[PDB]
Amino acid sequence: VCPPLRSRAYTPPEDLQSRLESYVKEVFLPSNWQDISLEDSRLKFNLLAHLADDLGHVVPNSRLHQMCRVRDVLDFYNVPIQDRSKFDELSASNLPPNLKITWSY
Amino acid sequence: YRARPPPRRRPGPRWPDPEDLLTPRWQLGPRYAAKQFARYGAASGVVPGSLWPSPEQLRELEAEEREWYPSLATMQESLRVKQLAEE
Amino acid sequence: IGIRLTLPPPKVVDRWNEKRAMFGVYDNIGILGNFEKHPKELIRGPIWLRGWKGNELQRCIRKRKMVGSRMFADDLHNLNKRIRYLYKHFNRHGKFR
Amino acid sequence: FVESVDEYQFVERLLPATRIPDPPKHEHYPTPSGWQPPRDPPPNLPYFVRRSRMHNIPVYKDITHGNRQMTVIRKVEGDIWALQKDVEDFLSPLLGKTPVTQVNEVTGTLRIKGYFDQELKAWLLEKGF
Amino acid sequence: EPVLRKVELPVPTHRRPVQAWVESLRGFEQERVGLADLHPDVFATAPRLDILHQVAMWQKNFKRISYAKTKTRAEVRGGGRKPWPQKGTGRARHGSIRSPLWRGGGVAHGPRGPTSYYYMLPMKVRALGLKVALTVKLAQDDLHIMDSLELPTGDPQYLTELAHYRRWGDSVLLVDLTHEEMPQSIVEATSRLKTFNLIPAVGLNVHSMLKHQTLVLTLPTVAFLEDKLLWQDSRYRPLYPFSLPYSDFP
Amino acid sequence: ARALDLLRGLPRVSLANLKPNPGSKKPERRPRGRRRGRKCGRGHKGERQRGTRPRLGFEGGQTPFYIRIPKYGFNEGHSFRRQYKPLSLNRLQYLIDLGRVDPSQPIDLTQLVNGRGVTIQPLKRDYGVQLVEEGADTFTAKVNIEVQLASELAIAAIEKNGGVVTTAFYDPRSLDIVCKPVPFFLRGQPIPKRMLPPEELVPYYTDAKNRGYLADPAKFPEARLELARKYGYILPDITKDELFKMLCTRKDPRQIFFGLAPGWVVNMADKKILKPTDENLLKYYTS
Ligand SMILES: [Mg+2]
Ligand SMILES: [Mg+2]
Ligand SMILES: [Mg+2]
Ligand SMILES: [Mg+2]
Ligand SMILES: [Mg+2]
Ligand SMILES: [Mg+2]
Ligand SMILES: [Mg+2]
Ligand SMILES: [Mg+2]
Numbered sequence: 032v033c034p035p036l037r038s039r040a041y042t043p044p045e046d047l048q049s050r051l052e053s054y055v056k057e058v059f060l061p062s063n064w065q066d067i068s069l070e071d072s073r074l075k076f077n078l079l080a081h082l083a084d085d086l087g088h089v090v091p092n093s094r095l096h097q098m099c100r101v102r103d104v105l106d107f108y109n110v111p112i113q114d115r116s117k118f119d120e121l122s123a124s125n126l127p128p129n130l131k132i133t134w135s136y
Numbered sequence: 137y138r139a140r141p142p143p144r145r146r147p148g149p150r151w152p153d154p155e156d157l158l159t160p161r162w163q164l165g166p167r168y169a170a171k172q173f174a175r176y177g178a179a180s181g182v183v184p185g186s187l188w189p190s191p192e193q194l195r196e197l198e199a200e201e202r203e204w205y206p207s208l209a210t211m212q213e214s215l216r217v218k219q220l221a222e223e
Numbered sequence: 224i225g226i227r228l229t230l231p232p233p234k235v236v237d238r239w240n241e242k243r244a245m246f247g248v249y250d251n252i253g254i255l256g257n258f259e260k261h262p263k264e265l266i267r268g269p270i271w272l273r274g275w276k277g278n279e280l281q282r283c284i285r286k287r288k289m290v291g292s293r294m295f296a297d298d299l300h301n302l303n304k305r306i307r308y309l310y311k312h313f314n315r316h317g318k319f320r
Numbered sequence: 321f322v323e324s325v326d327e328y329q330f331v332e333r334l335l336p337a338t339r340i341p342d343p344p345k346h347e348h349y350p351t352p353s354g355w356q357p358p359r360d361p362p363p364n365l366p367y368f369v370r371r372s373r374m375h376n377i378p379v380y381k382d383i384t385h386g387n388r389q390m391t392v393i394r395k396v397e398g399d400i401w402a403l404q405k406d407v408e409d410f411l412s413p414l415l416g417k418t419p420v421t422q423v424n425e426v427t428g429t430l431r432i433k434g435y436f437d438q439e440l441k442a443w444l445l446e447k448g449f
Numbered sequence: 450e451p452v453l454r455k456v457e458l459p460v461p462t463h464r465r466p467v468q469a470w471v472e473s474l475r476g477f478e479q480e481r482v483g484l485a486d487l488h489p490d491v492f493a494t495a496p497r498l499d500i501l502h503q504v505a506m507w508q509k510n511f512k513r514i515s516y517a518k519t520k521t522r523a524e525v526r527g528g529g530r531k532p533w534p535q536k537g538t539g540r541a542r543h544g545s546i547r548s549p550l551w552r553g554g555g556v557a558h559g560p561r562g563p564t565s566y567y568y569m570l571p572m573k574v575r576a577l578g579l580k581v582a583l584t585v586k587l588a589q590d591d592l593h594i595m596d597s598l599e600l601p602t603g604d605p606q607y608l609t610e611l612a613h614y615r616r617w618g619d620s621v622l623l624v625d626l627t628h629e630e631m632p633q634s635i636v637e638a639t640s641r642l643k644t645f646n647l648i649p650a651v652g653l654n655v656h657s658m659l660k661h662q663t664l665v666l667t668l669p670t671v672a673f674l675e676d677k678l679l680w681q682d683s684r685y686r687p688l689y690p691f692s693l694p695y696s697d698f699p
Numbered sequence: 700a701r702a703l704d705l706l707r708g709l710p711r712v713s714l715a716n717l718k719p720n721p722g723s724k725k726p727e728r729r730p731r732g733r734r735r736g737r738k739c740g741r742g743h744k745g746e747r748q749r750g751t752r753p754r755l756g757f758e759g760g761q762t763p764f765y766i767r768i769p770k771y772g773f774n775e776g777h778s779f780r781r782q783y784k785p786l787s788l789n790r791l792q793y794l795i796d797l798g799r800v801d802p803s804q805p806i807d808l809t810q811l812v813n814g815r816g817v818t819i820q821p822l823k824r825d826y827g828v829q830l831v832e833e834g835a836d837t838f839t840a841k842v843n844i845e846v847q848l849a850s851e852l853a854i855a856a857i858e859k860n861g862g863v864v865t866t867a868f869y870d871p872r873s874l875d876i877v878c879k880p881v882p883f884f885l886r887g888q889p890i891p892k893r894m895l896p897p898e899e900l901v902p903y904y905t906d907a908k909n910r911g912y913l914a915d916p917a918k919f920p921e922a923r924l925e926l927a928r929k930y931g932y933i934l935p936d937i938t939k940d941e942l943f944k945m946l947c948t949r950k951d952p953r954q955i956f957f958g959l960a961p962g963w964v965v966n967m968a969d970k971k972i973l974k975p976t977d978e979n980l981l982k983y984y985t986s
Pocket of ligand 5: 733734
């Protein structure tokens, strides 16, 4: 049975740093954990898979190589993303009373 | 869909039937057999002894060599007499 | 009046039929297959222009050389005349000389 | 009549190689021909000039129209504009004025008007590429 | 147990291998079963869309053989006699009823015989085009690495639903190492589909990669492509066609 | 890279987005419209517009330039002149430094071609490789090289650096075989016996001063001493060199490849060498 399609929208959690450092302790601990180099494939996979499973948002293959440090992972997971349609975006962009937008799609 | 199987070279030697009229003549001579032996080893099924010239062919080659490629001694003698004449 | 008064019947093209879907496959047969087969060997067509290109005169010369003996009588006569005319045109006419 | 033997070493010797061999390690550089391996670790610069498959600096003379002389630094990776700035700084004292150049960002190449192949090769060797 | 792949071929010291998620088709949610390191010179090269265009047009054209032909005034039937004398008739001068001017006459400059458009780009250029296509897919997030193409079932519905769930494109090009060993499940699944096309590794091409929105590769196919495309770099200039024996070329 | 990030941002690359590199596709000019129509750039009447102007080289009836000049034998026998590709000592040192030519083994035309240091075209009357004095001052490799021609200075440099140089003749067939052995082995023919130099070239290859492969070995030490005295270096005693055997190895005058003998058949498919045993064949191939 195919699971229902997942929404691509993702709002970063408020306790993002705490969750990330907990996962870092689980995977790898030392001071300045933000600079822990993700050069080991095993540890990189463990951390990224745990984060993806927890947050419902995974690092795309394009950015996977540039996620070189825990700081980079934190930046990627704190930048938000939205999946609303263009119609929804235009309608929610505070249209003035004299502007009407409709789709025949 | 699924792609058709990738094109591949016909494995092993290819031996056209001599009886067929459409087979090119260059595929029937000993040169073709030698090339097939070189390419496919013993799998060619051609007797290696055929590769070397038959005695008549060897006689023809020896005659041609005697006719056109003089020995080192003959070349040196011709050069010596030419130099003597020039001097 | 050389314009039709009705829309032509709609032309539906199946962009995902087998031919279009698998088009281009094995074009890299050489580089991706130890160069056992040259990509030109994937060309199906007239025997005299498989993996070969040239102008009209060269094409006619190649056709006569390769399949001339198997051509029909009038077709071969036409090919000979075309080769003659193309020779004359290419070797005796043109802006540049 | 026939006699098969295994002396195929003398044929393996004749067999040519398809892959360019890695240059052998020399105790002293530069080599008698002048070649020098790229510096390891790579220099920490905004750009990188990858060596050719022959392990030579990708700096080439070019000529067009019989009078336009140019030099091309071809295999450039990174900040081609930083490379252009460095080349201009290096060549202006030699030429007397800032050299005219084209930065082909798409191809990752730098073209400079005038022949400077030897000077640019030496300069890149000093930089360590 | 993560499936971790490292780059077998040497990587340039100034470049770090790009990375990708190794997935599996055995389950809908199996979107991360490992991590693969992909050679930078194959999957992180310059985006040369000009080379992409060159290779795509080559692929479209070199096979082309246009079978369009027209009869010239010499080949049109008849037209030997002069229609009428030069002078005295009061009509235009003509030498045959089959000249291009006449109705039913020959074609002055029409298509002539089966014409070939065959031309070969350098094999280095074609390999670089393949590399650029792979880099474009990876950068645009259309490339998906798999451990294997084995499916739980041969039902095309399962494959379509899995692609929709994973948000793949309307068109998927799945690639396997060799034709003979392709799993029966995926063979059955893709034989009945039109936008999901299964090809062997040797069949990868820029035109099909561009036509299909997403490109699915297996780890053996990744290694195969890396080796084949990197060899073109650091190969000598040929002494003779590579089909012939070489000291180190399979 | 920034380009890859821009790709990530940009729409998908498909067959509806491809465009040739600007400047690669010149527009096609065809004779339609005001500017390119009417006379279509062909001029006005005369032969040029009719497309019937006289052949190239025709001067309107005046005796052409290319015919009023007397015939001179500039190119007589050009297709019969022997050609030798130059191999400067600079090029040889470059190859040795890059490892494309291994100096620990005897260097010959096959090794040079395999290392891609030289390109021989027997069909274009190339008769082999000639050593060239260029780069002699900076040449330092000790090598046993066999070539077809060699300059006095090149020989001097090779011998000063402790190496050995011999000039070996190759008739066009043997030259082609040695340059491209693998195609010859695929031809399936038995290895032929190398032919002797033509009468004109016999003295060159029988002269010790050229290190000819047919010259008397007893005369080599005197020639080496003469070159050493002329060029002011001490003749190194190679007999004491650890690689003396390799330096001394020279193929037989009738032998194309070092180990393989004429008449042998190289079966590359199963890695074998068939050697004929018939007495007549052996006599012919030893002749
Ligand atoms: Mg040029
Ligand atoms: Mg007629
Ligand atoms: Mg008429
Ligand atoms: Mg008609
Ligand atoms: Mg005008
Ligand atoms: Mg007029
Ligand atoms: Mg006039
Ligand atoms: Mg007159």
